[PDB]
Amino acid sequence: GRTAHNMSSSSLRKKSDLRVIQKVPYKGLKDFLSNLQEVILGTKLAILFPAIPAAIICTYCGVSQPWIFGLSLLGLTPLAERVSFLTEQLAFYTGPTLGGLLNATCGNATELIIAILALTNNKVAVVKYSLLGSILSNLLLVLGTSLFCGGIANIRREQRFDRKQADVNFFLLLLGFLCHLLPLLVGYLKNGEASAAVLSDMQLSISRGFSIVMLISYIAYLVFQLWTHRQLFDAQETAVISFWSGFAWLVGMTLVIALLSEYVVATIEEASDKWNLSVSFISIILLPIVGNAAEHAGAVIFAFKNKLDISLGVALGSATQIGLFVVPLTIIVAWILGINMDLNFGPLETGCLAVSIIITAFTLQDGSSHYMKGLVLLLCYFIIAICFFVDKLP
Amino acid sequence: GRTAHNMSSSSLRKKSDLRVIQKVPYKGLKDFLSNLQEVILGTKLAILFPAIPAAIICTYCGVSQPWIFGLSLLGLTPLAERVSFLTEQLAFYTGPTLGGLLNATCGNATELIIAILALTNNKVAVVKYSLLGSILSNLLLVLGTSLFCGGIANIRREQRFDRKQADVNFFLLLLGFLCHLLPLLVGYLKNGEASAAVLSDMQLSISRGFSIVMLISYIAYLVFQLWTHRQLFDAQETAVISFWSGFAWLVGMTLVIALLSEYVVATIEEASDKWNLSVSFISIILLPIVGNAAEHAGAVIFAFKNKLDISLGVALGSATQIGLFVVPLTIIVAWILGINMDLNFGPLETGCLAVSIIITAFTLQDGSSHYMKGLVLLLCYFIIAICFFVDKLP
Amino acid sequence: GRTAHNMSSSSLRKKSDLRVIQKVPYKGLKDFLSNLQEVILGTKLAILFPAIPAAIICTYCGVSQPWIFGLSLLGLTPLAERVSFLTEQLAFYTGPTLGGLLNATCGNATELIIAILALTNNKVAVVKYSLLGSILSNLLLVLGTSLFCGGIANIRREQRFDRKQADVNFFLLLLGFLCHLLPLLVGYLKNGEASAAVLSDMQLSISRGFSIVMLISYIAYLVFQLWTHRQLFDAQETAVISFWSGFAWLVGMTLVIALLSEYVVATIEEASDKWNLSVSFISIILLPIVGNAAEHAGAVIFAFKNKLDISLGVALGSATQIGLFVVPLTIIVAWILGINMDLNFGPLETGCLAVSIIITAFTLQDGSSHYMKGLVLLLCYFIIAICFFVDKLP
Questions:
Q1: How far is the alpha carbon of A232 from chain B, nearest alpha carbon, in Å?
Q2: Which of A174, B52, B303, C230 is geometrically suited to a Cys-Cys bond with B146, CB 3.0 to 4.6 A?
């Protein structure tokens, strides 16, 4: 049996069989050209790989920073797909339990490296928008496109899913919303004869005590999902690359993601001036699209097959990891380094997170779906996108 | 098959058969006295028709403005019933699909003409209270009286409804609540070093971009309700007036509604002083009672018959039209004329709209009902009515 | 048939049969030593009864106030259990209907006497925290420990409850939340050119008009629960003490609770300084633990027996009585005496009450349970406890 993310990781794989240059005339370079054809050429997004050496040469030549920022997003779009592919090529050699533990802590690898490299460069605002923008993308854009495109193709058939597997995710997202609401309400307590230095050290001290509780709720979620109630999770039912070759490519792709994520962070303020876009719009709308490349194109294919237990397991499972594992890990790392970071996102950002959890919880509680459920979730994503397009706050 | 509003439009009809003055001694004036008896005398609210010529004569004689405002509400109470009756006397000559399109854009005719005539006379506050007061009336007063009066008469029987027909309405009302919450939160961003002229042009510019998205969500709702999923809407199953006579009375009643709606708008500030009532209380409590005259007395009769699919189709269907067709149409008309109008209702008004959608969504999600569900919705309407009675804000 | 609280009141009873000192050698003092062994020694919390005469002697000797406050909480912990035991020893002599009326108005006896004795001593803040802390304790701590400890012991069996008996409680808690939200939003209307004396008399005047509506919704709840829909409430199925002996002990225990509740109120400000704890933390966390002694240890035992209709009837039934009978009764008593008290708890307290009702309503709407539902409700209680531990607001 496979997990819900093993099924959806091989959705953009293209079978590449040259068998003319490599197979027949060669005798010695047979294994080296087989690993290279499988990993590099073996995808549907292989036209974006020349954007990786283009951004490195433009860095060491002196091209202006809006050109580097444009090419370093097209480079990370196939790299986030290969890392989310080579991990499931290790799950055949490790098993569905241990493979589900490497997938639960390294599923969102691009959203994790950006949120740390922007944290160490004192850009705490860019950390907060990109982590919020990855929760709203999975709840509204990835989930809305699945129920709308899979609801027009299957308009004459019957569409059902299991409620009990997806209700655990909305319980944890409401525990995470409480950890964002309460630092926001402390900052509106200025009537209590306390200065600005008193209210700011209270927001920082409760946000660091909340992050320990949020990590305990995610460790217990993994025991639920992998061992105690596995029976409703492996209801979905071979590796090509050898193990020690697949371990070497995974270290190689991670250093190139961590290299191109430095170009995104260092060239985001000047790319905002020359494009006349706010820094809040680029970080919350455009930048989470790079990470959700194979999850977004893997939950839609399993909606045309009317398997809506896989579309919900990818969309809701990746938003619980951002909200309760990647957000409270950033607070603990800032606790060690000594950087003032709390769970206060803002009044306009908390109100968008509140409605997005409530409208998703009412949509998915009868166990059936049609195309009108998936359109309301799309149009709520454009309302959020118009609001941060206009909000050019200097 | 009929719609849910065809069944509930003929609920206040009284059969008037004189057959002494008209039928026997006359020979020539037979058709003219038959249309006049059917339309004018053929209702249960025919004692309120002398209030229409009384308000016109008191206008041209010089009677003080609190007398004109009292009589111009009693005049519009049978006129809103005749327009909501003569349209369904055109649905027998047009069909259930085309007749459902004329009913979906002209169902709330009194709330539409008041909201435009008050807009062109620079009374933007009276527009915002009367459109909010028509959503809260349908969700709490019309829906609460149905489930309470139909839950005492049927206390020994079993009361059920179809959830899937009514869940589409609560998805759109949560999309509409997001378009009211976000202009409210921009006005609390005064910490971002922006003046009052900067925050006010941001509220106006996002409210005009939201209104295009709100109209697209209602056009797709009509395709859902009339053509794709008609099968759950015509589950409910002859015209008297000729077609070209019924078209002539519909133009005549609309001009008299548009005449008496001018008297309501022009005499609402002095009627507030002489009665010692706030302008917010008259517009949000008393004034939506005039429009919901046949919907309120048509959803209760079909609760004594234990047909709760018709009580929900009238109450929830008329609150989606106000919230997503009549509210965003007023923003587009003010965009053309050049009147500064946004979707900001206020902090006390948005908090009442938020709880009224949540408590109605939890009440109607098991598919059954009893009298205790309908009493909580009534007592939440009196809590809102006490709050705006005391709030006399100069 | 018994109620849901008759079953859970005798959960801490210990059978005490000496039969050596009393029974054999004595002939005259047989009935007096039988009532004394049944009431005093007949419990599992009988080691805390020496804390009652210790707090009285330390009062009349001159011991410092942090010592009296510590002993007067250990005294009230078995006294709240005996009063919640001797009332059900009167229900066998009165019946399940009249006995359910004495239990519905005297179930929370310790939270009622503290909220009045602190009201008459001008400590209105201590009244508002202890009444909020008894709603949050029953929804999160009592209900979360039941579903977690009864979900590990019954992990191989099937856990179900009846939704329709518990959905009435969440309808009334949302009617009560609206009565707390609207006085909070009037205090943020400072832009309307009104002074501080105008906004404060508007909060007081609507809070006294809301309390009449909240009491009418609870009287109708008792008619629902006891007479009209009793059939779903007595689905659960002998007294030892004579009636006129049990009436005499009930008057005696009430005067000692009302005596030790004076020591808690008079020694709470100096016990806050010498312990370096805020007055908000003691009143909202530590002090409601004293009242929920037999309800908390009576809903867990019936979760090991897989009878989750009794665990929900005790937890949710005691939070509706606090929120809609004990909170609006305190406003009416302050209306008579002339003490300025409204339903404004505060911005940080209203946001905790809002999320606690929503996360409890989504958890209990499929009719089944497991251990992961009960852990999220526990960890939401610690997030609230960390927030008021740090909030030391002078």
A1: 25
A2: B303
- To what resolution in angstroms was this structure determined? 3.0
Please list every residue in chain A whose beta carbon sits closer than 8 Å to the beta carbon of residue B228.
Answer: 155
Tokens 């019933």 locate to B81
Tokens of B100: 């459902």
Give chain B's contact residues with A (Cβ, < 8 Å). Answer: 163-164, 167-168, 170-172, 174-175, 177-179, 181-182, 185-186, 188-189, 192-194, 202, 205-206, 209-210, 213, 216-217, 220-221, 224, 228-229, 358, 361, 365
Task: Determine contact, residues C337/A149, Cβ cutoff 8 Å.
Answer: no
Q: What sign does the dihedral C31-C33-C39-C41 (CA atoms) show?
A: negative
Residues whose CB is less than 8 angstroms from the CB of residue A319 and which lie 6 or more positions away in sequence, other chains included = A134, A135, A138, A139, A169, A173
CA distance C125 to chain B (A): 24
- Rounded Cα distance between C109 and B136, Å, is 38
B373 to chain C nearest CA, in Å?
Answer: 8
Q: Name, in order, each residue with C-beta under 8 angstroms of A141's C-beta and a sequence gap of 6 or more.
A: A292, A296, A378, A381
Phi/psi at A124 (nearest 5 deg)? Answer: -75, -25
Q: Which one-letter DSSP state was computed for residue C97? A: T
The nearest CA of chain B is from the CA of A358 a distance in Å of 9
User: Residues C324, C172: contact at Cβ < 8 Å?
Assistant: yes
Residues 6+ apart with CB under 8 A from A351: B181, B182, B185
Residue A5, domain member (yes or no): no
| CA C149 distance to own-chain centroid | 21
Per the structure block, which two tokens stand in for C35?
A: 């009532």
Give the domain extent around A250. 32-237+243-390
Instruction: Quote the DSSP letter at residue A90.
Output: T
Question: Using only C-alpha atoms, what is the Rg of chain B?
Answer: 22
A111: Cα separation from own chain's centroid: 6
> Which helix (H) or strand (E) is A71 found in, with range?
helix A65-86
| Cα–Cα distance for residue pair B388/C2, rounded to 1 Å | 45
Q: What is the CATH number of the domain that holds A139?
A: 1.20.1420.30
User: Residues C113, C257: contact at Cβ < 8 Å?
Assistant: yes
Can you give the length of chain C in residues?
Answer: 394
Cα three-residue angle A217-A218-A222, rounded to 5 degrees: 120
d(CA C290, CA C114): 11
User: Considering only alpha carbons, which residue of chain C is nearest residue B377?
Assistant: C175
Q: Residue B139 falls within a domain, yes or no? A: yes
Rounded-to-integer distance, Cα C314 and Cα C337, Å: 33
d(CA C177, CA A165): 31
Tell me whether residues B171 and A386 touch, CB distance under 8 A.
Answer: no
- B368 three-class SS: strand
Other CB atoms within 10 A of residue C306 CB: 15
In angstroms, the CA C33 to CA C52 distance is 21
In a domain, A316, yes or no: yes
The tokens for A79 are 């790299």
CB burial string B148-174: b at 16+ within 10 A, e below: bbbbeebeeeebebeeebbbbbbbbbb
- Residue A218 CB contacts under 8 Å (≥ 6 apart), including other chains: A172, A320, A321, A324, A325
User: Do C379 and A167 make contact, defined as CB atoms within 8 angstroms?
Assistant: no
CA–CA dist C20, C340 (Å, integer): 59
Q: Which of A163, A171, A174 sits opposite C373 (nearest CB)?
A: A171
Contact B26, B33 (CB under 8 A): yes
Comparing CA positions, the residue from A40, A112, A135, A50 lying closest to residue A355 is A135
d(CA A136, CA C377): 24
Total domains in the fold of chain C? 1
Whether residue A229 is contained in a domain is answered as yes
Cβ contact, residue pair B194, A376, below 8 Å: no
